[PDB]
Amino acid sequence: REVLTGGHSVSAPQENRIYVMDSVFMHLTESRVHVYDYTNGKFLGMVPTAFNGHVQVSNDGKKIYTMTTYHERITRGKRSDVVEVWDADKLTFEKEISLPPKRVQGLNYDGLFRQTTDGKFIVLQNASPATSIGIVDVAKGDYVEDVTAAAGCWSVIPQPNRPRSFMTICGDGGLLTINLGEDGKVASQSRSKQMFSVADDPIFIAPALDKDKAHFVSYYGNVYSADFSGDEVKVDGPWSLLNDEDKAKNWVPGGYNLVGLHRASGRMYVFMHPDGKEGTHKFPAAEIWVMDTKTKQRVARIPGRDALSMTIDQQRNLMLTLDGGNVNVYDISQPEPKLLRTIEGAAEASLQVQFHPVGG
Amino acid sequence: EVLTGGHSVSAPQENRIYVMDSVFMHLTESRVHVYDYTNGKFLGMVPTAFNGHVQVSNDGKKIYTMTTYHERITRGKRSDVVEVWDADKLTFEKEISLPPKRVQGLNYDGLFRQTTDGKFIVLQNASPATSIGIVDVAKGDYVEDVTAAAGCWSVIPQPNRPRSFMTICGDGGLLTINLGEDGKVASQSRSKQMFSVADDPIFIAPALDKDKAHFVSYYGNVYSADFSGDEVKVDGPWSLLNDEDKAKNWVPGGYNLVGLHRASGRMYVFMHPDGKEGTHKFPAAEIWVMDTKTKQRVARIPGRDALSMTIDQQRNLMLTLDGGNVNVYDISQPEPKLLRTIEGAAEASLQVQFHPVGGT
Amino acid sequence: HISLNPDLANEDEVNSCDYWRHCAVDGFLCSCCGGTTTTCPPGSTPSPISWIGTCHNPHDGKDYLISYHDCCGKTACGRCQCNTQTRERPGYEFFLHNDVNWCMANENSTFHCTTSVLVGLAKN
Amino acid sequence: HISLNPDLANEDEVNSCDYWRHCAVDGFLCSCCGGTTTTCPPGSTPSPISWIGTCHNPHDGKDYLISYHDCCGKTACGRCQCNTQTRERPGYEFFLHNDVNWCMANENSTFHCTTSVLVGLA
């Protein structure tokens, strides 16, 4: 009467899909990406990612990229660090791209595994522990460039206004900009003036990324900006997230992927908690603050639901937050976010959620 | 201070037990947890990849594991292996290649055993056609498939002979295999029918004596296979149940659900009431203790929802295991006495084993 | 009709271990894993072999032959774990047995999820 | 002082994330994993590199330099998980950073457990 078949595609349209990167830290060799429908909480499928996988979806929406480490016998034998290309609709493996055995092993900050705006190159963080940025040519399926200019820097912030440009945060408190050629090799580079004091006002690496500028929040609740509307990045800051009442209760930011920007309004979303002090920078959110980046003032504050990480969908005006296991879906079409639903048990140990790209 | 490796397990062998954690939720990261049963201390672990099986060498020097790897875990070439690990250092020593058909399944003792003399590992294969594999441990060789065991399941070593074992066949009888010094089959014999497969199926777990094995059935009967003489003599049923027991539908249930205290002839069995079709793997409401000579029950105690057990003849102990927690009992008298519970010994274990002491 | 067609039924049920056809299921229900009762979640492969058995349909009163195929080649789904054992038997009646990985003969034997495929009325 | 010698302390104190020297620990404490504060559990290998930092010892009032080495080459221990962050900084101050696997340069980078090794006075 019935026959079990394979070869099927994900049951919900791409525009409904989100990707919860489950580190499964208790069993970190069996990390995976869980695919959910944010509109109804339905589990749609998954992609296995071996030891401490990282994930992103191609900017054109067609493919999923993972980054992972294998060994011949898991806990012994030869190491293989790879990028894998997977079909986004069939959730099937297509291609392995060999990396040098130094891909970053670490928590799933967005900036460790990114891509150029044009989608042609994957841009990833290495640590051996010496740092460099690796470039993968997706079409060729090859590792093509190793940006040693980025030694002592960390994380990749793509510039959405250029096809193959990105920035990284360096040990001087400034930014290094890399512009890749059409071959994925460095075509040019520049270094900004110092944006922040590494020692006195360290920033969180997570950008609140606009089309032509990025904002960063600091451990003490300050905000810095990098404007890349020109070839030379112009840096500024600090302005404070905090008013005097806020300062009295020691409110500070905390989390991992802890900020986001709604580009149409300029609203920046930040996880905050009271009673800040040394050692609280990864505390769960007591609140989400909504900042107007033009006026440099808060416009709204809502309960944080112990969230640690977030992501924003621009075109549907949505924010996801994630507490490690549960994903909260918010409507951010108006200045006060509205909670639509909570997807419980989306992961055992996730610090990263991402939407399927719809912007092309 | 300096962090160093190369250390041995802190507690002596006689204190050690092995909890085979399948980690079914993340079954590619199964492992053996080593505990001290005297105080509940965690001593170390052995990684066992996908659905590992484990036993300790009869001489107590080595831990044997059986597992499956693939080059890329969920794709690539399969390698089924036995691994030899040093028991005191918990380090990998040697891999022995198996044909890619080792049994993948829950951790019944009888799927991965050894001859009494310790020279050969004897393991269950399923491709799904069943055969028994023989591994020469010293030589590190797979000697060959006992295809004579097709349609049979599990390995019951004969403790009164150096390299003989039995298996339970689909005809309701037992097949005995006697190996030569090379590990190849030297002779075999088949018993008469012991039990009706259709009407009174037995659990595969033996209550194993030196020269006989007892088995319990889904309906609470007991069968035996006596291998004291040239050929196996079979008998049964006798019932575990008195009238009152039968009236409340008491039946056995569990996985490694029986044990024998050889010196006394006491058989230990997990039991539950309200038995009917489909309850044969229910957790123990009670543990019953039967005198196999008188065919009478001599004790009944709370089951603590246990599913599996193991007996130590040298210290007169029983361990029970509910999937996560290990209960330690003194069984030197007819009524077992609960000494302690080791909480959180595993996430998903159906098998615990003592480190062998003595036993020549 | 309705009791034989899980794709038309209430998902909550189909996704339950008490659903009539899931009567000897050991593992994660594929219908909770991005698949359906008869379709593997994307990127997982059906097993060519399975344990089998009959289950009683309490709606139409008939007994049906079920093939408990797995989907394979992806790591554990983790959702809707069942451990039902109606008429399940040990490995000496191998094809009625559910404590083995019915992915064991797949190109990749990693177990993802399991399901209950309706073959037809029990043989008579 | 006793506060410098974890092997002489009560295990419950040493196995706690609030033990003074565990002030920037991200992971499972090796002392809960069959090892001790300064010995890897059997069959796991020390990391030759680590994140570092100082921690205040409230028992003697002094500040100490700590090396947060991992033990590697076995799968996750799973016991006594900590996530303390005193003076921890992001990856642009890499050797103060604890959101990376300090087993990354080991022969086998699988993370087993982590610990806090006392180097000396800060």
Short mmCIF file of N, CA, C and O in Angstrom, two decimals, chain B residues 94-165:
data_model
loop_
_atom_site.label_atom_id
_atom_site.label_comp_id
_atom_site.label_asym_id
_atom_site.label_seq_id
_atom_site.Cartn_x
_atom_site.Cartn_y
_atom_site.Cartn_z
N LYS B 94 45.28 -0.78 19.85
CA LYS B 94 45.22 -1.51 18.57
C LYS B 94 43.79 -1.55 18.04
O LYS B 94 42.84 -1.69 18.81
N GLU B 95 43.67 -1.45 16.72
CA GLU B 95 42.43 -1.64 15.99
C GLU B 95 42.51 -2.96 15.23
O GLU B 95 43.53 -3.26 14.61
N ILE B 96 41.42 -3.72 15.27
CA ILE B 96 41.29 -4.97 14.53
C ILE B 96 40.14 -4.77 13.57
O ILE B 96 39.03 -4.50 14.00
N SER B 97 40.39 -4.92 12.28
CA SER B 97 39.37 -4.69 11.28
C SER B 97 38.40 -5.84 11.24
O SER B 97 38.81 -7.01 11.26
N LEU B 98 37.11 -5.51 11.19
CA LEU B 98 36.04 -6.46 11.02
C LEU B 98 35.38 -6.27 9.67
O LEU B 98 35.40 -5.18 9.11
N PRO B 99 34.72 -7.29 9.17
CA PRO B 99 33.88 -7.05 7.98
C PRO B 99 32.75 -6.11 8.37
O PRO B 99 32.33 -6.07 9.53
N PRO B 100 32.23 -5.33 7.42
CA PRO B 100 31.28 -4.26 7.75
C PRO B 100 29.87 -4.76 8.01
O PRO B 100 28.89 -4.39 7.32
N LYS B 101 29.75 -5.61 9.03
CA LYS B 101 28.48 -6.19 9.40
C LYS B 101 28.38 -6.50 10.89
O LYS B 101 27.54 -7.31 11.31
N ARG B 102 29.22 -5.86 11.71
CA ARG B 102 29.10 -6.09 13.15
C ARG B 102 27.71 -5.63 13.60
O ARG B 102 27.18 -4.67 13.07
N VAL B 103 27.14 -6.29 14.60
CA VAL B 103 25.81 -5.92 15.05
C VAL B 103 25.76 -4.49 15.55
O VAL B 103 26.55 -4.11 16.42
N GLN B 104 24.81 -3.74 15.02
CA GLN B 104 24.44 -2.42 15.50
C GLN B 104 23.12 -2.60 16.21
O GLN B 104 22.12 -2.98 15.61
N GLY B 105 23.13 -2.37 17.51
CA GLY B 105 21.96 -2.59 18.34
C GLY B 105 22.25 -2.35 19.79
O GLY B 105 23.38 -2.07 20.17
N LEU B 106 21.21 -2.53 20.59
CA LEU B 106 21.31 -2.30 22.01
C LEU B 106 22.29 -3.26 22.65
O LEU B 106 22.55 -4.36 22.13
N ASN B 107 22.80 -2.86 23.81
CA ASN B 107 23.95 -3.50 24.42
C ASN B 107 23.63 -4.69 25.31
O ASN B 107 23.94 -4.71 26.50
N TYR B 108 23.06 -5.72 24.70
CA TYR B 108 22.97 -7.02 25.35
C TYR B 108 24.36 -7.61 25.48
O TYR B 108 25.17 -7.53 24.55
N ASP B 109 24.65 -8.23 26.63
CA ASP B 109 25.97 -8.82 26.86
C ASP B 109 26.38 -9.78 25.73
O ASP B 109 27.53 -9.78 25.28
N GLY B 110 25.43 -10.59 25.28
CA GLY B 110 25.70 -11.68 24.36
C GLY B 110 26.07 -11.26 22.95
O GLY B 110 26.34 -12.13 22.12
N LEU B 111 26.08 -9.97 22.65
CA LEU B 111 26.49 -9.54 21.31
C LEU B 111 28.00 -9.37 21.14
O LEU B 111 28.50 -9.25 20.03
N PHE B 112 28.75 -9.37 22.25
CA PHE B 112 30.16 -9.08 22.23
C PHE B 112 30.76 -9.71 23.45
O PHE B 112 30.65 -9.17 24.53
N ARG B 113 31.36 -10.89 23.25
CA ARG B 113 31.82 -11.77 24.32
C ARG B 113 33.22 -12.29 23.99
O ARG B 113 33.86 -11.85 23.04
N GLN B 114 33.71 -13.22 24.80
CA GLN B 114 35.03 -13.80 24.57
C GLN B 114 34.99 -15.23 25.05
O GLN B 114 34.14 -15.60 25.86
N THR B 115 35.91 -16.04 24.53
CA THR B 115 36.01 -17.41 25.00
C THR B 115 36.49 -17.37 26.45
O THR B 115 37.10 -16.43 26.90
N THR B 116 36.26 -18.46 27.17
CA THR B 116 36.67 -18.53 28.57
C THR B 116 38.18 -18.33 28.72
O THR B 116 38.63 -17.64 29.63
N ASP B 117 38.96 -18.88 27.78
CA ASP B 117 40.40 -18.72 27.85
C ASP B 117 40.93 -17.32 27.48
O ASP B 117 42.12 -17.05 27.60
N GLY B 118 40.02 -16.46 27.03
CA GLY B 118 40.35 -15.08 26.68
C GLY B 118 41.07 -14.90 25.37
O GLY B 118 41.43 -13.78 25.01
N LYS B 119 41.31 -15.98 24.62
CA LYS B 119 42.11 -15.89 23.41
C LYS B 119 41.33 -15.29 22.23
O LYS B 119 41.94 -14.63 21.37
N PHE B 120 40.02 -15.47 22.24
CA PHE B 120 39.17 -15.06 21.12
C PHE B 120 38.02 -14.19 21.60
O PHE B 120 37.38 -14.48 22.60
N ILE B 121 37.82 -13.11 20.89
CA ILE B 121 36.59 -12.35 20.98
C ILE B 121 35.60 -12.99 20.05
O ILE B 121 35.93 -13.39 18.93
N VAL B 122 34.36 -13.08 20.51
CA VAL B 122 33.28 -13.76 19.82
C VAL B 122 32.15 -12.76 19.75
O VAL B 122 31.65 -12.35 20.78
N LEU B 123 31.80 -12.33 18.55
CA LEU B 123 30.86 -11.22 18.35
C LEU B 123 29.76 -11.56 17.38
O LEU B 123 29.91 -12.42 16.50
N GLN B 124 28.63 -10.89 17.50
CA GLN B 124 27.50 -11.12 16.63
C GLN B 124 27.54 -10.18 15.44
O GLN B 124 27.76 -8.97 15.57
N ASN B 125 27.36 -10.76 14.26
CA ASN B 125 27.20 -10.02 13.02
C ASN B 125 25.79 -10.09 12.52
O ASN B 125 25.08 -11.04 12.78
N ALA B 126 25.41 -9.06 11.77
CA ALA B 126 24.12 -9.07 11.07
C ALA B 126 24.22 -8.20 9.84
O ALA B 126 24.56 -7.02 9.93
N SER B 127 23.95 -8.78 8.68
CA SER B 127 24.12 -8.07 7.41
C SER B 127 22.87 -7.76 6.54
O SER B 127 23.06 -7.08 5.54
N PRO B 128 21.64 -8.18 6.92
CA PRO B 128 21.05 -8.72 8.15
C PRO B 128 21.21 -10.23 8.38
O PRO B 128 20.85 -10.70 9.44
N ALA B 129 21.77 -10.98 7.43
CA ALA B 129 22.01 -12.39 7.72
C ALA B 129 22.96 -12.46 8.89
O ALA B 129 23.90 -11.66 9.00
N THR B 130 22.71 -13.42 9.78
CA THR B 130 23.46 -13.47 11.02
C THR B 130 24.58 -14.50 10.93
O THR B 130 24.48 -15.54 10.27
N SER B 131 25.70 -14.15 11.53
CA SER B 131 26.83 -15.02 11.69
C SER B 131 27.59 -14.56 12.92
O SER B 131 27.34 -13.46 13.43
N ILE B 132 28.45 -15.42 13.42
CA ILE B 132 29.26 -15.09 14.56
C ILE B 132 30.68 -14.85 14.09
O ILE B 132 31.24 -15.66 13.32
N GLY B 133 31.29 -13.74 14.48
CA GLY B 133 32.65 -13.45 14.13
C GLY B 133 33.61 -13.82 15.23
O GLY B 133 33.31 -13.66 16.42
N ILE B 134 34.78 -14.34 14.84
CA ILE B 134 35.83 -14.71 15.75
C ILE B 134 37.05 -13.85 15.48
O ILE B 134 37.53 -13.78 14.37
N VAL B 135 37.54 -13.20 16.54
CA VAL B 135 38.70 -12.37 16.50
C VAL B 135 39.77 -12.97 17.40
O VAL B 135 39.55 -13.23 18.59
N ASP B 136 40.96 -13.15 16.82
CA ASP B 136 42.13 -13.59 17.56
C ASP B 136 42.78 -12.34 18.11
O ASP B 136 43.35 -11.54 17.39
N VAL B 137 42.67 -12.13 19.41
CA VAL B 137 43.06 -10.84 20.00
C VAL B 137 44.55 -10.57 19.86
O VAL B 137 44.94 -9.50 19.45
N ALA B 138 45.36 -11.55 20.23
CA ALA B 138 46.83 -11.41 20.20
C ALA B 138 47.33 -11.13 18.80
O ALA B 138 48.10 -10.19 18.58
N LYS B 139 46.86 -11.92 17.84
CA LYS B 139 47.27 -11.75 16.45
C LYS B 139 46.65 -10.51 15.82
O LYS B 139 47.18 -10.01 14.83
N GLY B 140 45.54 -10.05 16.38
CA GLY B 140 44.83 -8.88 15.84
C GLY B 140 44.14 -9.19 14.54
O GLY B 140 44.07 -8.32 13.67
N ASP B 141 43.61 -10.41 14.41
CA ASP B 141 43.04 -10.89 13.16
C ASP B 141 41.59 -11.25 13.35
O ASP B 141 41.20 -11.75 14.40
N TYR B 142 40.80 -11.01 12.31
CA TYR B 142 39.47 -11.61 12.19
C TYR B 142 39.65 -12.99 11.57
O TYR B 142 40.04 -13.12 10.42
N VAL B 143 39.37 -14.03 12.33
CA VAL B 143 39.69 -15.40 11.92
C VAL B 143 38.72 -15.92 10.88
O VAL B 143 39.14 -16.40 9.83
N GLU B 144 37.42 -15.92 11.18
CA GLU B 144 36.39 -16.01 10.12
C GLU B 144 34.98 -15.99 10.71
O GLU B 144 34.82 -15.74 11.93
N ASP B 145 34.00 -16.09 9.81
CA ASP B 145 32.56 -16.04 10.09
C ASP B 145 32.11 -17.43 10.40
O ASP B 145 32.35 -18.34 9.60
N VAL B 146 31.36 -17.60 11.46
CA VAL B 146 30.71 -18.85 11.75
C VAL B 146 29.34 -18.75 11.09
O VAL B 146 28.36 -18.31 11.69
N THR B 147 29.28 -19.11 9.81
CA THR B 147 28.03 -19.02 9.08
C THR B 147 27.07 -20.14 9.49
O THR B 147 25.89 -20.09 9.18
N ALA B 148 27.58 -21.15 10.19
CA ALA B 148 26.73 -22.18 10.78
C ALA B 148 25.68 -21.62 11.74
O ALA B 148 24.65 -22.25 12.00
N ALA B 149 25.94 -20.41 12.25
CA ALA B 149 25.05 -19.74 13.19
C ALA B 149 23.98 -18.89 12.52
O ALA B 149 23.26 -18.18 13.20
N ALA B 150 23.84 -18.97 11.21
CA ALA B 150 22.78 -18.27 10.52
C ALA B 150 21.44 -18.64 11.13
O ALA B 150 21.19 -19.80 11.45
N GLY B 151 20.59 -17.64 11.31
CA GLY B 151 19.30 -17.83 11.97
C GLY B 151 19.35 -17.99 13.48
O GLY B 151 18.34 -18.29 14.11
N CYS B 152 20.53 -17.77 14.05
CA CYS B 152 20.70 -17.76 15.49
C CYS B 152 21.07 -16.37 15.96
O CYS B 152 21.29 -15.45 15.16
N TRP B 153 21.15 -16.21 17.27
CA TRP B 153 21.43 -14.90 17.81
C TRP B 153 22.06 -15.00 19.19
O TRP B 153 21.55 -15.70 20.10
N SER B 154 23.17 -14.26 19.33
CA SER B 154 23.87 -14.00 20.61
C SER B 154 24.80 -15.11 21.01
O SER B 154 24.67 -16.24 20.53
N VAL B 155 25.76 -14.78 21.85
CA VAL B 155 26.85 -15.66 22.21
C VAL B 155 26.80 -15.92 23.70
O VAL B 155 26.87 -14.97 24.47
N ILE B 156 26.72 -17.19 24.10
CA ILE B 156 26.79 -17.59 25.51
C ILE B 156 28.05 -18.46 25.67
O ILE B 156 28.04 -19.64 25.27
N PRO B 157 29.13 -17.91 26.22
CA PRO B 157 30.32 -18.72 26.42
C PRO B 157 30.05 -19.84 27.40
O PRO B 157 29.23 -19.70 28.30
N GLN B 158 30.73 -20.97 27.21
CA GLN B 158 30.67 -22.07 28.18
C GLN B 158 31.83 -21.93 29.15
O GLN B 158 33.00 -22.05 28.75
N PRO B 159 31.55 -21.56 30.42
CA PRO B 159 32.66 -21.31 31.32
C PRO B 159 33.50 -22.52 31.76
O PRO B 159 34.56 -22.31 32.35
N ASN B 160 33.03 -23.72 31.42
CA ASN B 160 33.74 -24.97 31.76
C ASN B 160 34.64 -25.46 30.63
O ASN B 160 35.27 -26.51 30.76
N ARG B 161 34.74 -24.71 29.53
CA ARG B 161 35.59 -25.07 28.38
C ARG B 161 36.33 -23.84 27.88
O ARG B 161 35.84 -22.72 28.04
N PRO B 162 37.53 -24.02 27.33
CA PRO B 162 38.37 -22.89 26.95
C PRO B 162 37.89 -22.04 25.77
O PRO B 162 38.06 -20.82 25.78
N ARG B 163 37.32 -22.68 24.76
CA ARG B 163 36.96 -21.96 23.55
C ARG B 163 35.71 -22.55 22.92
O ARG B 163 35.67 -22.88 21.74
N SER B 164 34.66 -22.64 23.74
CA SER B 164 33.36 -23.09 23.33
C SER B 164 32.28 -22.10 23.72
O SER B 164 32.36 -21.44 24.78
N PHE B 165 31.27 -21.98 22.88
CA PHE B 165 30.15 -21.09 23.19
C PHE B 165 28.92 -21.62 22.51
O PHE B 165 29.00 -22.50 21.63
#
